[PDB]
Amino acid sequence: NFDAERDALNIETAIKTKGVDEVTIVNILTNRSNAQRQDIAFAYQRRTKKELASALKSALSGHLETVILGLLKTPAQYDASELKASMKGLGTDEDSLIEIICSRTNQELQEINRVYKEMYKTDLEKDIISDTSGDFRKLMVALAKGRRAEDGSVIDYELIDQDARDLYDAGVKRKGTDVPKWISIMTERSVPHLQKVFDRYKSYSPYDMLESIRKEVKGDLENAFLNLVQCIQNKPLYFADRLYDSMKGKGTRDKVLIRIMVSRSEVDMLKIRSEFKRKYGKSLYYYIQQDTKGDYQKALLYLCGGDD
């Protein structure tokens, strides 16, 4: 059914329509997979000899432009560009750097590292170093390598118990904190293993892993650990909470809302929606509908994939 040549022609017609037909552009692009959007971009240049991204940047504006241009990038290109943006200047937007590095898998990070180097002619690790310091830097650099252990064929209960005790003895039990121990265990063990470790951890500490972090460390280091533990425990819930935070109260933190809707639309949006509804009462669709307007709202609601 999909025909990149047909979609490209219709988009060209919309772009050249007096006043620009943003609706048609949104109706098409937010209802095509990332791979299909790539096919559409190639078809567009094949037909017009002009680049689709450039054409749309000129035709669109505001938040809608941000969403559409984001959707046109491959997943790795989008993440790489978002990382670059987070470290721009003094890299004050540590929250975004943390969101991406803490939530991406080994496979995703491998491609991100490759693409980042191709796009910016520099190692992602080097820019991360420039935008981080102390143990926060050590944690972020370790995570960005995307070398977390593979899932084992058999559950290692003795190791699970061992890691749980080490996490306790390294933090809540002693004065100060053995941060390197925390970094090693939380970056090197597989996610399923760590989920069990954090559960077993409750047998040694009166505070769960998250509260232990709030009591042991502070600043960006603390936020990085909190974000990482949430992604390990329940990634869809992690994104649901970030989405809620991006819309709660006056205004909207579009940078976060847009990035999550674009980057997770084809990954785990159904689960994100389920967790969102379960925790906040209203559907993600409802929150988006209430926090945004026009074609921008339309685009985000299509990426949401439906109401709950």
* Site residues, Ca ion (CB under 5 A): 19-20, 61, 171, 247, 252, 291-292
Cβ-based nearer residue to Ca ion, 99 or 291: 291
Least CB distance to Ca ion at residue 59 (A): 7
Q: How far is the CB of 266 from Ca ion (least distance, A)?
A: 24
Residue 184 vs 190, nearer CB to Ca ion: 184
**Nearest by Cα to 51 from 63, 38, 64:** 38
Under 8 Å CB-to-CB from 108, ≥6 apart: which residues?
75, 76, 79, 146
**49 vs 175 by CB, closer to Ca ion:** 175
Separation between Cα atoms, residue 209 and residue 194, nearest integer Å: 11
Residue nearest to Ca ion (CB): 252
Q: How far apart are CB 126 and Ca ion at their closest, in Å?
A: 31
Shortest separation between residue 213's beta carbon and Ca ion, angstroms: 11
Is 144 or 247 the residue whose CB approaches Ca ion more closely? 247
Q: Does residue 171 contact residue 182 with C-beta atoms inside 8 Å?
A: yes
Q: State the residue for tokens 């009591």.
A: 215
Q: Of 19 and 89, which has the nearer Cβ to Ca ion?
A: 19
Least spacing, CB of residue 140 vs Ca ion, in Å:
22
- Distance of closest approach, residue 103 Cβ to Ca ion, in angstroms: 23
Q: Give least dist CB 248 to Ca ion, A.
A: 6
For Ca ion, which is the closer residue by CB, 143 or 288?
A: 288
Residue 206 structure tokens? 């009166």
Residue 171: what are its φ and ψ, rounded to 5°?
A: -130, -90
Q: DSSP string of 207-225?
A: S-HHHHHHHH--HHHHHHH
Task: Using the minimum distance from each CB to Ca ion, give the nearer residue, 187 or 292.
Answer: 292
Question: Could you tell me the smallest distance in angstroms from the CB atom of residue 216 to Ca ion?
Answer: 5
305: enclosing H helix or E strand: none
| Residue with the two structure tokens 């039990």 | 173
Residue 120's Cβ-count burial label (10 Å; 0-12, 13-18, 19+) is middle
| Helical ranges in the chain per DSSP H | 4-16, 22-29, 34-48, 52-59, 62-72, 75-86, 94-103, 106-120, 124-130, 134-144, 157-169, 179-188, 191-200, 209-216, 219-233, 235-247, 254-264, 269-280, 284-291, 294-304
For 35: left if phi > 0, alpha if psi spans -120 to 50, otherwise beta; the answer is alpha
Nearer to Ca ion, 61 or 105 (CB): 61
How far, in Å, CA of 258 to CA of 256, rounded? 6
CA dihedral 129, 138, 98, 277 (to 10 degrees): 170
- Closest CB to Ca ion among 103 and 292? 292
CB of 292 to Ca ion, least distance (A): 5
